[PDB]
Amino acid sequence: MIIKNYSYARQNLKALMTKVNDDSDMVTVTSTDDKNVVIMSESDYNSMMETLYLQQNPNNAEHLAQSIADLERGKTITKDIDV
Amino acid sequence: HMIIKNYSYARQNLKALMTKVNDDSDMVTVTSTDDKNVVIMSESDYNSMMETLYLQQNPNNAEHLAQSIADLERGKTITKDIDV
Amino acid sequence: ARLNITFSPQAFEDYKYFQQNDKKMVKKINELLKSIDRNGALEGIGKPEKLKSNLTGYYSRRINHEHRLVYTVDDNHIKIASCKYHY
Amino acid sequence: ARLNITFSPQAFEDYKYFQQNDKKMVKKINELLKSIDRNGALEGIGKPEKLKSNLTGYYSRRINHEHRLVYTVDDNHIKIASCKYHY
């Protein structure tokens, strides 16, 4: 998580784009107009949107948490599947 | 409200995108030739997203929020004057 | 010194529990409520923020690092969904 | 072709439901499983995505626009948490 200003971020835009994708970092870009932005990788953006999608309904959030717990516990069903 | 531009557009049109992200609540995806793309959003939208994920990330709390918002919607509620 | 507040049943139990176990927590909640009544939903202490997804229409302010006051304002009347994280 | 797959109990019940009632779902799920086994958790059809929060370590692929295959790969063994959205 990185805090920089506009006039720095306008110059080395590509250097900040590679730094948020490989170090999994974030950049807040500050303006004098009190209109700040946050830059993240598209991978991290799609992950949070997909996570919010899966957790958006409480029955589904519960279903995922019970299932992940069952897999960690070994309360589970293992079968050969004709694919 | 997603907007998709490439790297060379985003270099010198930086405030043109930063202002329309904050004013119109838009987001901006910036593509790349090596396709390590980035997404730009307002600080408010980022904080709103992180706060929502924080509240959903335990299922007992997601369920507690869903049940409470439901009870508020149908009026199964307690209304009191409280000392503040 | 008085605010007419509508609670969800779980938010009221947690508020009552704080009253007989953590008065320092009640006072910080009350400061958030007073700020909401004076400044509206998105301005004042506690880093107010809109919520998204199925929490759309509600807002959060920070009571402390763990607990959030989750609330909405319906024609200046404050409704509280939560004042305590339920792990 | 045969793959040895570990299911959560609810994911297995939903897969069995799809076998009886929606064979187009099973075929798409089976396609995603073949792609995970050949390419790993992050490569191939279905827009594979890392998940966050309490789903960290798990991945999602799209079965259709609604249902996700939520899965993890443990030493090339595929474990299925979910293959159906639960509303």
Side-chain angles (χ1 to χ4, degrees), chain A residues 1-54:
Chain A
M1 176 48 178
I2 306 170
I3 302 174
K4 307 296 194 170
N5 66 91
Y6 189 128
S7 50
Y8 193 3
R10 192 185 172 176
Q11 173 60 225
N12 42 24
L13 177 59
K14 182 73 75 165
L16 289 182
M17 289 182 60
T18 63
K19 202 177 298 182
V20 304
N21 284 259
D22 290 313
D23 284 354
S24 301
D25 260 307
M26 315 249 171
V27 176
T28 284
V29 173
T30 319
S31 67
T32 56
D33 305 309
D34 204 11
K35 297 193 166 83
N36 297 349
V37 289
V38 171
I39 305 174
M40 69 187 64
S41 73
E42 175 175 33
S43 303
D44 282 355
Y45 173 73
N46 290 328
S47 284
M48 288 160 45
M49 296 273 95
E50 185 68 23
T51 304
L52 282 164
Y53 173 61
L54 290 172

Side-chain angles (χ1 to χ4, degrees), chain D:
Chain D
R2 285 174 91 187
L3 285 176
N4 188 252
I5 303 291
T6 295
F7 295 83
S8 80
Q10 296 171 38
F12 187 62
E13 288 302 316
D14 296 335
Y15 189 83
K16 274 174 75 183
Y17 173 79
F18 284 146
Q19 283 183 305
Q20 182 190 352
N21 310 269
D22 204 330
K23 300 173 170 53
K24 310 185 185 108
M25 280 290 184
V26 182
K27 176 177 181 287
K28 181 51 187 308
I29 288 171
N30 289 352
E31 279 175 26
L32 295 170
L33 290 172
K34 290 194 202 66
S35 177
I36 292 156
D37 171 77
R38 296 195 328 268
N39 311 312
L42 281 176
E43 302 300 305
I45 48 167
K47 310 283 179 170
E49 253 149 38
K50 273 176 190 159
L51 307 179
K52 300 310 179 181
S53 301
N54 64 314
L55 317 178
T56 302
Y58 279 78
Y59 302 87
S60 87
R61 283 168 194 235
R62 304 176 79 101
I63 306 166
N64 58 2
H65 202 281
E66 170 179 334
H67 297 314
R68 302 296 193 263
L69 186 66
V70 182
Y71 65 94
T72 197
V73 187
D74 200 358
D75 296 304
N76 279 90
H77 184 73
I78 302 169
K79 299 172 156 188
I80 303 189
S82 189
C83 64
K84 183 185 188 288
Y85 205 99
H86 282 222
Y87 291 93

